[model samples]
Target: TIKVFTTVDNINLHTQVVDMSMTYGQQFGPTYLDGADVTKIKPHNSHEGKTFYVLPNDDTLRVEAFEYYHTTDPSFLGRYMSALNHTKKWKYPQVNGLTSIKWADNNCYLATALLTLQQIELKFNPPALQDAYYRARAGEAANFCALILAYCNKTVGELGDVRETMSYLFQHANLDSCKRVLNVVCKTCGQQQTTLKGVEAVMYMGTLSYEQFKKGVQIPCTCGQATKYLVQQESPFVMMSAPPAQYELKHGTFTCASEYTGNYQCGHYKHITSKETLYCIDGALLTKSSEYKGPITDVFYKENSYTTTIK
Candidate 1:
């Protein structure tokens, strides 16, 4: 991921001002005090009479308390205090909303993006915020949809193999016959919208992408067969997000708690060639004179898998 740096104007700085006051606690004297100036025994004018300022003549322990507050960076210090109102919580809703906006089928992607957003806001310096924003946007719901559609096209390209195989099986492997089947499937399956048609289209597209499966291997398949006959092309659905890194506790006896479990939240898969097959060969293949289902099953089951986990 790339990082971008940009400065926020006075408006953002002003917003941080309230944050400072809340973090340190409020002062009620002639001079106002923010989080960096408050101490334990300087006399806060309240009924319970807690101190707000550091007195010059207080004990050595009291003097140390004043030094601690004075030396702490306001942003770093505010993070630990219970004083001011902070908008840091807005990070979650923004991430979840973006993910939902990107992928209609995959809720996990949305969760992943959200958690990543939170981690960035919490851990990274101000300069890294823009990078986080871009990553979340890239993994957005709309982007996922576009990715799936592109994969569909690649899968449909695979159908050329299916056409060739069918031609060999029926002894009708001419280009003209293949084109006819392609057209028929397009009209019947694509126009009619059947689920089987959908499957056919996906498989067809996947077959096209399978062309580069094993171009250099001496014995690609277990039987020592040349890969040209058994080549499987690659899908374009590469992994989008890297899993977040974990950090250890950095403070006192009480540990700093994590807001998110480090892992990617999205899932993605697609088949487009089947759609192309349906579009280009549905009626032609289904309406053939004889019935045959052998090679077809081989093409469809090539990429079978039940689980793809990331740890």
Candidate 2:
């Protein structure tokens, strides 16, 4: 006698067939199976059963099973079959691709839904917009930053009230929306595209401060030198390099004898205790403390006038 059992709620067992076989006396049971058979039958494993059929409440399990089958499952035919099944059932607007419909109560579902929509849109959209979508969805901060810059450049024409736009993009715009905007922007700004790193883009768009933008971006001069410029709040993005200033060493500190124009400056300092050396640019200190045998330096001077000696 062979007993066939199926699952109802992923835990409860339901008897579908009892003692059904090829013999004359053992042919009186349900011919159809609702779920996997726990008895000795072909493809009688939980994973295999999940691939073919799943409960209505099995959306999360279905997603996990589909991922597992796609990546790790050794059976090629099984993987193909599972992929086909998921592709068809996931888009049932009634199901909203399983990610959103079944898991609608979670924020993750919303993100999943947006991404799925973006994927579908990209599939049918123009080829020119493809790269921007790819960049926006590339899962890198720099890409996202580039995407946001491209988006603002095209739609808004100019980055107006930078703080407002920055806040909106960070708080309200999802990655999928960002991708869509980036696609449009890329199509608009082809060949003359401007890109910024992740933190730079955020600081530029969010703060709207010229100093912040100058600090983040490397501006090029007409003289072929990549120079840092002093930014005025009234006319930001206008390139203006400050005149050279003179430094004077006084009381172990190199003070600027002339008016300091730019926020950034190249300088070096030494640790008083361990006699170690360090460097700084734009007020941000840089050092190799791990490689240094002594303590790190604290104060930075515009000029290295002090001689290093064992104190």
Candidate 3:
């Protein structure tokens, strides 16, 4: 039989109890047989040693069937399994004249509930007051570090020496208590790049003007050519230009005093009719004066003599 209790006038409701000895044809209840065999029987008492659910309705209580294995004493079972038996323990420090109660199904629920209670208590009592308790709890270090970061308006990556500083703080004191200490340390310590000045600024600041800085700096121009200097000067230095050497016509061929030679002009000559000998002097042709002289080679012909013919 399953028993349920309600806070309204402390009423106890019971399930319709039945004799299982004759029903199952077994000396013991369902626990004596395999679960598959137990399931075969009608009105199976698989929950022989357990109370599955105790639900509360508005003015009535819904109690499910209860099964028993070791003892059949109703009083003894009620002392242990009855939800009302543990009501006072659950009702301590009542909330709005009501209390919450849970009959844990297994030992796991008991252990988890106790651990959760401990965490709640720790949260209410500050770490400074509960130093010994805080030290024994799990996740205390991480929790304290998170608190430090939160209080200081910073992050783990922003901290100066994470491992060393966190270790030092944890070694000396807890993370919750190190807020002001971390704030001071963060303000004074960390990695920062040192600023540097160029060679001109440090060594020759007043000696050179801003305009002079632009004088020697060459920059690319819009015309696909680079300007020699960035700044325009009043009197720019002129690049010397060499005048071309004079050409003298010798034997109807023009030759310069220097190694260079000029193109020759012959009025009546056509292209070369036969393979006559001709000399190339410094990229210019030297022809013997003759009536059968070829046409005067143009400037293009002089530079590109390989394509020209002697007539």
Candidate 4:
């Protein structure tokens, strides 16, 4: 359910196990866990549709052998499709409770777990588990990383909400059929248009759209004007270098524990946060403004929790 590729044979073979426009939780802005510490940040739902977590790639978890790789080591999934056939921004191993709920290996959690294992080698098995030999059956591969480890809330995400939930589920679940050629820098003159080929960059190629690059839309500066945000390496096989420049999203609600105990306690939070500005140059300022506000939440619990004391 995603693309904007320019090579690597276009990382095809399907990928997007879960990204139903993301909900249930996702707040931590910038580089996946930005600076951290905001009254222990709280929110089970601060906005965006509302508690969505639809699952169905059935077979209770099939795949007899799609060659799964445990965590960040065991390596497989064709070596992350050969590390998405190279683009740049590489360097990892910083995992740990990076502001809690672990895994800080960057690039929005390794490009959403390498497009959920390329949506498990082509939509839960079909073309003979994607020929190249090997052998396995009954497909299943991280339904979009099990919908981002079950509803964005690991303290909810925000390395630009993984590029706005993979460009709003690849633009309406594979409708507009994803497209990207980003890398633009023009706060009015610093000018730098990575790729759109020649012809003075023909109308700035495809005029950037994937629901207008997911929300903040605007890109046509050949110094002409207009440069909303897009280009800080969210693709080209996902690269990185941002400390959350701009995204302006903020929601608030409280009560994680005034009493109770554990999960945190009385639990009742809501957040969608965004307060980033300290950009001492993070690889060329890339703006991420998904200006959302008008209806959203998801109290996801089936059991429920929050009461801040988090240190």
Candidate No. with top TM-score: 4
lDDT of each: 0.23, 0.26, 0.23, 0.25
Return the candidate ranking by lDDT, descending.
2, 4, 3, 1
Off by over 4 Å in 1: 1-42, 45-85, 88-311
Give the per-residue lDDT digits (tens) of candidate 2, residues 1-311: 44444432223444433333342112322112322222234333332223122222244443443332222222322222233332223221222111111221111212222233222222212221233345434432222222333333322122222223333333322222221001111222331223332223222322222333334344434443242322222211111112333322233232111122322322221211111221111111122221222212111212111122211
Off by over 4 Å in 2: 1-107, 114-116, 119-311
Off by over 4 Å in 3: 1-15, 18-42, 45-58, 62-116, 122-311
* Ranked by TM-score, top first: 4, 2, 1, 3
Q: How large an RMSD does model 3 have?
A: 42.6
Candidates 2 and 4 compared: the better one by lDDT is 2
Model 2: lDDT to the true structure: 0.26
Query: Clashing pairs in model 3?
Result: 48-67, 48-68, 271-311, 272-310, 272-311, 273-311
* CA lDDT, candidate 2, residue 8: 21
How many backbone clashes does every candidate have? 45, 1, 6, 14
* Cα-based lDDT at residue 167, candidate 1: 21
lDDT for 20 (candidate 4): 28
Task: Put down candidate 4 lDDT per residue, 1-311, tens digits, no spaces.
Answer: 11111111112222222232432123211101111212123332232222211111232212322232112222222233322223112322211101111133233432333322232212322222233112212222222232332222222222323333333332212122113334445775774534332212111223222223323345567557564434322121211212222222232221010011113222221222222321110111222333433212211001111111211
